[PDB]
Design a protein around this ligand. Structure first.
Ligand SMILES: [Ca+2]
Ligand code: NA
Lengths: 281, 63
């Protein structure tokens, strides 16, 4: 039997599924450590590796990209978990090696590949404390080209009045996602700042792991693909909506939580986002 | 203890020694400063970001 992880229910993805919308024909690039394409609860449609010493994007030597992919798009069947957008066309864009790290140029090359290959959504469950001009230009180019770009806010917690959101989440063109638990409480590690845009579940999130396994991970890395998967659901119901419109639909229909410094606009609600008329619940 | 600001500018060797006294089961990974990394939270992990001289270039923290 398949299980629906709590976070998929919490963002109201089953309401889209019951309307008949599951992300079909939407192309989502998981820009990350690879995706294990042999997992029976994932279908990987394509991809490319930008990591010089790990040339196979369908081999995930870390596990992180596989877990993130399962939250976006684990298949709807009688096994494992159910993804937010279980019919999405999933692309493994490997820019991180086994140790979880990548050079800025590798991430940028992955973003460029996504643009050249007409991806509809990019998820980046990754970041660092400093930006670069070339990084900002790559994310700005993807957004100018029509791509919805979603990233983890970072796990830097609080630091008085200072923002702790990492890059590329911290750029205005990217939707930065923080983490809440099943009670809608912000996770203590979740980054904060005026750049925090929305929140999604990021505590004890069950998903796919390499070698046909499953497990619970924590992080804004886990929250980001709820929002990337939500963007795919929205585009499957409204295939002509632009990235501008998908982004506003998610922002304008959150359930507001606390102060925006800590919670942004609140928890995403993809049922409300995918209606024509938007308001907060 | 979950952050070590006093270790910035020390050698990676001294940082490892100090962190393992405070947190003996720590999983320490050394990475170049200015790389991009996965955004998952691992309570057992301490990443150490080093400059090209192998000195600590960013405050080590659990995660
Ligand atoms: Ca399944
Ligand atoms: Na942003």
């Amino acid at each position: 039997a398949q299980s629906v992880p709590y976070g998929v229910s919490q963002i109201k993805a089953p309401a889209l599924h019951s309307q008949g919308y599951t992300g079909s024909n939407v192309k989502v690039a998981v820009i990350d450590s690879g995706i294990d394409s042999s997992h029976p609860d994932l279908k990987v449609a394509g991809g490319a590796s930008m990591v010089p010493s790990e040339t196979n994007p369908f081999q995930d030597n870390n596990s992180h990209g596989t877990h993130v992919a399962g939250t976006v798009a684990a298949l709807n069947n009688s096994i494992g978990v159910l993804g937010v957008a279980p019919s999405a066309s999933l692309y493994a864009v490997k820019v991180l090696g086994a140790d979880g790290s990548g050079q800025y140029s590798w991430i940028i090359n992955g973003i460029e590949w996504a643009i050249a290959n007409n991806m509809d959504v990019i998820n980046m469950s990754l970041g660092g404390p400093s930006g670069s001009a070339a990084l900002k230009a790559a994310v700005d180019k993807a957004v100018a080209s029509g791509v919805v770009v979603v990233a983890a806010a970072g796990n830097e917690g609080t630091s008085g009045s200072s923002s702790t959101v990492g890059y590329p989440g911290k750029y205005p063109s990217v939707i930065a996602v923080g983490a809440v638990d099943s009670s809608n409480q912000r996770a203590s590690f979740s980054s904060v700042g005026p750049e925090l845009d929305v929140m999604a579940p990021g505590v004890s999130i069950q998903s796919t792991l390499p070698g046909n396994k499953y497990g619970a991970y924590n992080g804004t890395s886990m929250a980001s693909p709820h929002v990337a998967g939500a963007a795919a659901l929205i585009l499957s119901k409204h295939p002509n909506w632009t990235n501008t419109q998908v982004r506003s639909s998610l922002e304008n229909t959150t359930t507001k939580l606390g102060d925006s410094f800590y919670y942004g606009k609140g928890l995403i609600n993809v049922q409300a986002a995918a209606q024509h008329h938007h308001h907060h619940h | 203890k979950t952050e070590w600001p006093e270790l910035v500018g020390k050698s990676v060797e001294e940082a490892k020694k100090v962190i393992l006294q405070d947190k003996p089961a720590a999983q320490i990974i050394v990475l170049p400063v200015g790389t991009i990394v996965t955004g998952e939270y691992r309570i057992d992990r301490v990443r150490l970001f080093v400059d090209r001289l192998d000195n600590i270039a960013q405050v080590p923290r659990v995660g």
